[PDB]
A and B are shown apart, each in its own frame.
Chain A
Amino acid sequence: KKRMIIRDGVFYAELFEFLKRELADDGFAGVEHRVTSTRTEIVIRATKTREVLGEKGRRIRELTACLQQRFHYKEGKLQLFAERVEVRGLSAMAQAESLRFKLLSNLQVRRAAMGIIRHVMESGAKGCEVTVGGKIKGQRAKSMTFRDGYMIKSGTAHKNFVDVATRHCHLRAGTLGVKVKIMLPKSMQNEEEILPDVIT
């Protein structure tokens, strides 16, 4: 139908949101939602599992319950999972989290920025960027940027190599922007937008 799609859509939104927000500092990145008939299998993909799953499974069962009451599932029609996504550097969202945490704890600007860009480009990233806007020095805002490697910014091929993320840091005397980009060495399967190459 036209409708079944939109159901799955709005579901996937709300789901995503609630996890992204309330589950912090585990390096949350993605999920996936699928159904096998009469079950629902929702995986969760976050850098650090031991925080997600809880000490003996309290945390994961918690989330399960929450979901069920909202979207009106029965038990045994919903089950959740965790996974480690290792190579933390190659997720926007992961490094956005980490960077946020440091700025909230009264670390500087340039120090924090650099630390990210290190860990990224060691993981094997082609190039990355980081931005911070908002207060710094005092009055009349400011914006600054830190760049390493190289990246594309046009086409639809920067929408299949570069996935970005944006977050806030709430402080006294101002809000403070933050954003992190990160161009991957890989596509979502394979593809290169240009680069003709001769195989002998």
Chain B
Amino acid sequence: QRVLVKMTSRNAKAVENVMTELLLHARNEKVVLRGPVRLPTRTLKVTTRKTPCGNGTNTWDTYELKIYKRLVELRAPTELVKKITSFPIDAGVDVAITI
């Protein structure tokens, strides 16, 4: 492995606060940053009939979720990673998968 921080979320304008600002700490602030960035957004798509009984003209609804995914890289910091990560914990339903 290397140090790979991934960020996943259910909406945009959530990810951007975490990534695109508040990984500031590793950016130009103290140490090197190699920044790759963002990945295929996936769609989770659940088609569902609209009538609670059997009648009608056979209408439907389609519902959707969006996933959002991000990814950034650091070249062996030796427990500066503690600092860098911990400052943004922010926004409900953003999760942070550090490797």
Verify whether A and B have any Cβ pair under 8 Å. yes
Q: Which of these, B10, B89, B91, B92, contacts A5 with CB under 8 Å?
A: B10
Does A8 sit within 8 A of B, measured CB to CB?
A: yes
Does A106 sit within 8 A of B, measured CB to CB?
A: no
CB distance from B8 to the nearest CB of A (A): 7
The 6 closest A-B pairs by CB, nearest first: A34-B92, A36-B89, A8-B93, A5-B10, A32-B92, A4-B95
Residues on A facing B (Cβ under 8 Å): 1-2, 4-5, 8, 32-37
In whole angstroms, how far apart are the Cα atoms of A36 and B89 in the complex? 6
Chain A: CB-nearest residue to B10: A5
In whole angstroms, how far apart are the Cα atoms of A113 and B50 in the complex? 31
Does B12 sit within 8 A of A, measured CB to CB?
A: no
Asked if A2 contacts B42 (CB within 8 A), the reply is: yes
Does B3 sit within 8 A of A, measured CB to CB?
A: no
CB distance from A128 to the nearest CB of B (A): 28
Instruction: Name the A residues within 8 Å of B44 (CB-CB).
Output: 2, 5
A-B contact count (CB 8 A): 23
Asked if B89 contacts A37 (CB within 8 A), the reply is: yes
In whole angstroms, how far apart are the Cα atoms of A19 and B10 in the complex? 24
Instruction: Name the A residues within 8 Å of B10 (CB-CB).
Output: 5, 8
Does B67 sit within 8 A of A, measured CB to CB?
A: yes
Instruction: Name the B residues within 8 Å of A1 (CB-CB).
Output: 8
Interchain Cβ contacts under 8 Å between A and B, 23 examples? A1-B8, A2-B42, A2-B44, A2-B67, A4-B8, A4-B95, A5-B8, A5-B10, A5-B44, A5-B65, A5-B67, A5-B93, A8-B10, A8-B93, A32-B92, A33-B92, A34-B91, A34-B92, A34-B93, A35-B92, A36-B89, A37-B89, A37-B96
In whole angstroms, how far apart are the Cα atoms of A35 and B95 in the complex? 9
In whole angstroms, how far apart are the Cα atoms of A5 and B65 in the complex? 9
In whole angstroms, how far apart are the Cα atoms of A196 and B67 in the complex? 34
In whole angstroms, how far apart are the Cα atoms of A2 and B96 in the complex? 14
Chain A: CB-nearest residue to B93: A8
CB distance from A43 to the nearest CB of B (A): 10
Extra A-B contacts (5), CB below 8 Å, given A5-B67, A36-B89: A2-B44, A5-B44, A5-B65, A33-B92, A34-B92
Instruction: Name the A residues within 8 Å of B96 (CB-CB).
Output: 37
Contact mask for chain B residues 1-40; partner A; CB cutoff 8 A; 1 contact, 0 none: 0000000101000000000000000000000000000000
CB distance from A159 to the nearest CB of B (A): 14
